[PDB]
Subunit: 56 residues, 9 copies
């Protein structure tokens, strides 16, 4: 049960901040039906990542 | 009786942060009907786990 | 029980059940045409991460 | 007029935390119509009750 | 005309926590139409009242 | 010209009106088929409790 | 260098908001999923924040 | 070479926002599930946030 | 072992955001519940968060 170390944490946040990452969400396909799909990680999230990298 | 220990907490946080995990959500299947489904844990929740991990 | 108070360890055991994915919550699910029904879902990733946080501060 | 004291506050939070409480919500009954009903208090709200009991 | 002092505040918060209060919300009545009505105060709000009472 | 600045007791008078359930806010309300109108409803519980909290702190 | 609001001008603005004077632009339904831009009174929540800022001043 | 917005510059921008000079792109309903991009004034909550930050300067 | 953004890199990225040079991907209604992916300007809320941080630096 490995544990992510502080520098591996800064790496993962860097990828997010650099627009490199995606998240799964629900997307309308029509008449109420939805499908799973991947979208870029949002501005809000990318900013939080940027905030943390700055506190490093 | 079980109380998750501090190291075990980091382990669990690590599995989330590394995109290994899912949550149960509702998804539309047509005309107002929904199904229970599993999706990846969001960027938002991953970044929080990542934040907690960098403060350890 | 009308004056039962959860003690510190009880709180941590309860958070541990949440954190470990052993708990549910009652939500409203759509069953067609605007109609909803009560159902139980796994506690969310967000709520589990709060429990984890809390267990990590202990 | 009554003022809840600390011990009563913790008793009330305890029932919440233990999943013994309900809240009134709006539930869809068809074609935009809704009705009042009671649901279990949410995980979020329970978890806040625990955090508060953890701090006493 | 009036300013609430701290003990009056607690009195009002107590009513809320004890579940003696309501709030006005919009409820659907069908075909997009909504109607004003009252519901019990939510658990989130009741918990906040509790939190303040226990910190008094 | 000197513009108005709410003074200490005036803020408390306003929060008190809110807390007491004397005030309203403007919101959009469905009237049929996706169309909405503007109306007033009572300030909500969350907002009243925030007013109360600020009153307690003063 | 441009225009920067001073500490007083901030309070003046906040007071107009707290006093129910201001509005904000929102989207309103006009039917069948279609919406239009309209203005509405600044909300209770936003007025309470303003009151707060004025209270801490 | 690359730009870093300095403290004074930030206050100028926040001031434009607090005054009601700025807008944001949002999705608006146009009927039957269709939305379109359009601009609206920056909301009250966001303006009050700019006001808070300027107030603390 | 892998790339980590340094402080000035962070400020540069935040500056792009505050300045309204950046977008985000979202889902938009195209009809009858159908959605498609598309890019929108970064919202005011987020631009003000970037502004705040820059002010802090």
């Amino acid at each position: 049960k490995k544990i992510l170390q502080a520098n591996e944490v800064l790496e993962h946040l860097t990828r997010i901040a650099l627009g490199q990452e995606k998240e799964q969400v629900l997307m309308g396909i029509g008449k109420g039906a939805e499908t799973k799909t991947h979208v870029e990680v949002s501005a809000k999230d990318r900013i939080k990542a940027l905030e943390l990298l700055g506190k490093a």
